[PDB]
Amino acid sequence: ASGLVASNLNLKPGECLRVRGEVAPDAKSFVLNLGKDSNNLCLHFNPRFNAHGDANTIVCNSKDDGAWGTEQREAVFPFQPGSVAEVCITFDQANLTVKLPDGYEFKFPNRLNLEAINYMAADGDFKIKCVAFD
């Protein structure tokens, strides 16, 4: 019952991936994953409203050949359950850059050294409404 899954994205360095989706009204958190496949994620983007012991904190992590890396928590939280949110992601060999609804942007290390992002998946609390490549 998870969310949208997309493969063969062929997102290249410098290209902008814009993802707009509706955060479920009863969401305790939501997830947007990006990578090569489900076991190799260059970005596990996980805003947590009240989940896993965290409150209003964006948790990011990488997954390499199945192994979860060291999480990085962000400084802001421009998200609310039951509302539309858009994020924009770009990357280079060193870092991924994520821009949030509030115009705030941060970087997350490209630990898989990806030269292309072909996989994206949202969970059941983030209903993707549109994806743009520019």
Added chain:
Amino acid sequence: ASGLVASNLNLKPGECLRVRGEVAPDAKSFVLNLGKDSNNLCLHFNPRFNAHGDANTIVCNSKDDGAWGTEQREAVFPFQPGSVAEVCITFDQANLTVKLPDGYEFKFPNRLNLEAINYMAADGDFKIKCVAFD
């Protein structure tokens, strides 16, 4: 090596899928497949610039458990190599409605009696720039 593939779309009757992409400068044909999965398509949307004996003709077909149905051909071809083109597909119980770049609309019967579209795949000389799932 191919085009974007999206699953778990859960597109219900009355909902519309908007797909915008770039038609290759030397495009011969491109495809947008919609359905339950890769072998069960309620809509194989195939604009053929120069392919299989067709010259600038939109060919549509269904695919039931791997078997191609009876092809349908349209009377217009609002696609031009080297230009952006957008198509809007609405899903309904009886038919799918396709609205072309110039506003021309046509319907294709929902032969498989799908109650929802969960699969979308792009192929050929068409680079997807954005998809909206509403």
